[PDB]
Design a protein around this motif. Structure first.
Motif, mmCIF file in Angstrom:
data_model
loop_
_atom_site.group_PDB
_atom_site.id
_atom_site.type_symbol
_atom_site.label_atom_id
_atom_site.label_comp_id
_atom_site.label_asym_id
_atom_site.label_seq_id
_atom_site.Cartn_x
_atom_site.Cartn_y
_atom_site.Cartn_z
ATOM 1 N N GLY B 9 0.795 -1.204 0.000
ATOM 2 C CA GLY B 9 0.000 0.000 0.000
ATOM 3 C C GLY B 9 0.835 1.265 0.000
ATOM 4 N N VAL B 10 0.337 2.256 0.727
ATOM 5 C CA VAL B 10 0.965 3.556 0.825
ATOM 6 C C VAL B 10 1.684 3.684 2.171
ATOM 7 C CG1 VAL B 10 0.501 6.005 1.038
ATOM 8 C CG2 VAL B 10 -0.679 4.672 -0.697
ATOM 9 N N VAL B 11 2.966 4.033 2.110
ATOM 10 C CA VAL B 11 3.827 4.063 3.276
ATOM 11 C C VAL B 11 4.317 5.472 3.592
ATOM 12 C CG1 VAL B 11 5.943 3.161 4.252
ATOM 13 C CG2 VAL B 11 4.557 1.778 2.736
ATOM 14 N N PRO B 12 4.208 5.891 4.860
ATOM 15 C CA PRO B 12 4.668 7.216 5.278
ATOM 16 C C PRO B 12 6.182 7.275 5.227
ATOM 17 C CG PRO B 12 3.297 6.184 6.934
ATOM 18 C CD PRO B 12 3.698 5.117 5.994
ATOM 19 N N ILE B 13 6.713 8.362 4.678
ATOM 20 C CA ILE B 13 8.152 8.511 4.580
ATOM 21 C C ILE B 13 8.620 9.645 5.460
ATOM 22 C CG2 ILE B 13 10.054 9.123 3.100
ATOM 23 C CD1 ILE B 13 8.428 7.769 0.832
ATOM 24 N N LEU B 14 9.826 9.487 5.984
ATOM 25 C CA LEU B 14 10.449 10.500 6.801
ATOM 26 C C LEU B 14 11.940 10.529 6.510
ATOM 27 C CD1 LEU B 14 9.003 11.540 9.899
ATOM 28 C CD2 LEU B 14 11.526 11.385 10.047
ATOM 29 N N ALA B 83 15.479 -6.395 2.260
ATOM 30 C CA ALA B 83 16.224 -6.128 3.487
ATOM 31 C C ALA B 83 15.373 -5.463 4.561
ATOM 32 C CB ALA B 83 17.438 -5.278 3.195
ATOM 33 N N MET B 84 14.083 -5.282 4.280
ATOM 34 C CA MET B 84 13.165 -4.652 5.234
ATOM 35 C C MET B 84 12.533 -5.689 6.169
ATOM 36 S SD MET B 84 13.534 -1.438 4.592
ATOM 37 C CE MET B 84 14.366 -0.577 3.256
ATOM 38 N N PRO B 85 12.196 -5.278 7.405
ATOM 39 C CA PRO B 85 12.219 -3.905 7.915
ATOM 40 C C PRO B 85 13.503 -3.493 8.656
ATOM 41 C CG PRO B 85 10.652 -5.367 9.118
ATOM 42 C CD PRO B 85 11.698 -6.197 8.434
ATOM 43 N N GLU B 86 14.462 -4.392 8.848
ATOM 44 C CA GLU B 86 15.676 -4.007 9.565
ATOM 45 C C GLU B 86 16.458 -2.986 8.754
ATOM 46 O OE1 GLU B 86 16.478 -8.558 10.488
ATOM 47 O OE2 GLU B 86 15.027 -7.665 9.044
ATOM 48 N N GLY B 87 16.268 -3.043 7.437
ATOM 49 C CA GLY B 87 16.795 -2.044 6.525
ATOM 50 C C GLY B 87 18.162 -2.315 5.928
ATOM 51 N N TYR B 88 18.719 -1.283 5.308
ATOM 52 C CA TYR B 88 20.035 -1.355 4.700
ATOM 53 C C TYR B 88 20.809 -0.050 4.847
ATOM 54 C CZ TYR B 88 17.420 0.891 0.848
ATOM 55 O OH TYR B 88 16.599 1.689 0.089
ATOM 56 N N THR B 114 6.670 3.760 9.649
ATOM 57 C CA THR B 114 7.273 4.765 8.784
ATOM 58 C C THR B 114 8.581 4.304 8.172
ATOM 59 O OG1 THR B 114 6.314 6.469 10.199
ATOM 60 C CG2 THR B 114 7.996 7.146 8.638
ATOM 61 N N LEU B 115 8.758 4.568 6.881
ATOM 62 C CA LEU B 115 10.036 4.295 6.229
ATOM 63 C C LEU B 115 10.921 5.516 6.421
ATOM 64 C CD1 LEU B 115 12.010 4.378 3.510
ATOM 65 C CD2 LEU B 115 11.682 2.349 4.882
ATOM 66 N N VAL B 116 12.042 5.334 7.110
ATOM 67 C CA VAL B 116 12.898 6.445 7.519
ATOM 68 C C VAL B 116 14.285 6.401 6.896
ATOM 69 C CG1 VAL B 116 14.138 7.476 9.440
ATOM 70 C CG2 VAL B 116 11.757 6.665 9.715
ATOM 71 N N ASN B 117 14.726 7.541 6.381
ATOM 72 C CA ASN B 117 16.026 7.662 5.741
ATOM 73 C C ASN B 117 16.848 8.729 6.458
ATOM 74 O OD1 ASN B 117 18.139 7.558 3.823
ATOM 75 N ND2 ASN B 117 17.046 8.890 2.384
ATOM 76 N N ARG B 118 17.882 8.317 7.198
ATOM 77 C CA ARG B 118 18.747 9.261 7.915
ATOM 78 C C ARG B 118 20.138 9.263 7.315
ATOM 79 N NH1 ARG B 118 16.012 10.436 12.579
ATOM 80 N NH2 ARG B 118 14.487 8.821 13.215
ATOM 81 N N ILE B 119 20.579 10.432 6.865
ATOM 82 C CA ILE B 119 21.806 10.561 6.092
ATOM 83 C C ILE B 119 22.763 11.532 6.743
ATOM 84 C CG2 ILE B 119 22.670 11.089 3.813
ATOM 85 C CD1 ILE B 119 19.279 11.482 3.644
#
Lengths: 115, 231
Positions: B9-14, B83-88, B114-119
């Motif tokens: 579906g539709v996933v909230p991004i942050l 690789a989700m949900p632990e991520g990459y 929430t799908l989160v991207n921290r850079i």
């Protein structure tokens, strides 16, 4: 497609309380400043209350400051106007108002204050 | 594979970015949503430190490829979702032609729903009056092919591609991307065959936004190489 629908109007006696609400569709009610106006019979539409897009700020016109309280439920995409200490001069049609691209009005709801 | 059910579906991004380019620090906060089903991102980014010291388009690639649309016949090559949900962990070095370079390290994971991207981004060797620090990139973005390849050894993928930045004098400036993604979890992930992604992006502005910001609409679809008559 954006649309506003007020409801909650009624006859109430002076000093009474009443709580208007407005159902918004077509946009997130938490991304735009929402406002309430009221139009008496044969008078100019008058701004009554509003809250900022972010929700952090609320403003009222002098004549209702302290008696009305605007609020919103983001999830139900609904805006409210709590009214207390209603006076006869609060009689009017109440419209809810938003600006997404162009200006949108609800069709209004009637509030009558008299014994 | 088990991960891909998280994108039905539709996933909230942050998104959260801390940057330092030639000593010019800055932060960006982003939000919106992804719909991998149509390979569609909608996001809004704010420079939370005021004025962005670099052109917003230089930050696009850095700012969630799990939201690519992998057509049915390729579902098995979607490393990102698997690789989700632990991520990459996603790391890049971006080379701006005749100018400086960014080095980035990001973590893309679920935190709640929430799908989160921290850079963290770090740029050096930039010219103080080049296209980047001098703000000479047009405010638009182009459509690219992102080439993906397996990295058996790191248990991930290795990605390469070139972004074409429109400069306002009519020229275009290449930004050479060297990318590398490795799972955070121990879980099993899909290691893909050589393929690539088709990207399209449209940058715009919120008319009612005073803050330095970027509104982004982006569609990405996986595609896959058809060999010629030389087999």
């Amino acid at each position: 497609q954006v649309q506003l629908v007020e409801s909650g109007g009624a006859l109430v006696q002076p000093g009474g309380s009443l709580r208007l609400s407005c159902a918004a569709s077509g946009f997130p009610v938490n991304r735009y400043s929402m406002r309430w106006y009221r139009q008496a019979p044969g008078k100019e539409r008058e701004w009554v209350a509003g809250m900022s897009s972010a929700g952090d700020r609320s403003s009222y016109e002098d004549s209702v400051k302290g008696r009305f309280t605007i609020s919103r439920d983001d999830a139900r995409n609904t805006v409210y106007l709590q009214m207390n200490s209603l006076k006869p001069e609060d009689t009017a049609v109440y419209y809810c108002n938003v600006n997404v691209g162009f200006e949108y009005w609800g069709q209004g709801t009637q509030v009558t204050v008299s014994s | 594979s088990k991960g891909e059910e998280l994108f039905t579906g539709v996933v909230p991004i942050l998104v959260e970015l801390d940057g330092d380019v030639n000593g010019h620090k800055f932060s960006v906060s982003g939000e919106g949503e992804g719909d991998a089903t149509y390979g569609k991102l909608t996001l809004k980014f704010i420079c939370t430190t005021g004025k962005l010291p670099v052109p917003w388009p230089t930050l696009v690639t850095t700012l969630v490829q799990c939201f690519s649309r992998y057509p049915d016949h390729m579902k098995q090559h979607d490393f990102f979702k698997s690789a989700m949900p632990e991520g990459y962990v996603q790391e890049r070095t971006i080379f701006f032609k005749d100018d400086g370079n960014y080095k980035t390290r990001a973590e893309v994971k679920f935190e709640g729903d929430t799908l989160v991207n921290r850079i963290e981004l770090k740029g050096i060797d930039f010219k103080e009056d080049g296209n980047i620090l001098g703000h000479k990139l047009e405010y638009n973005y182009n459509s690219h092919n992102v080439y993906i390849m397996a990295d058996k050894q790191k248990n991930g993928i290795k990605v390469n591609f070139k972004i074409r930045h429109n400069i306002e004098d009519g020229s275009v400036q290449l930004a050479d991307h060297y990318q590398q993604n490795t799972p955070i979890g121990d879980g099993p992930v899909l290691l893909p065959d050589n393929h690539y992604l088709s990207t399209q992006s449209a940058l715009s502005k919120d008319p009612n936004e005073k803050r330095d910001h970027m509104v982004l609409l982006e569609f990405v679809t996986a595609a896959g190489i058809t060999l010629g008559m030389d087999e």
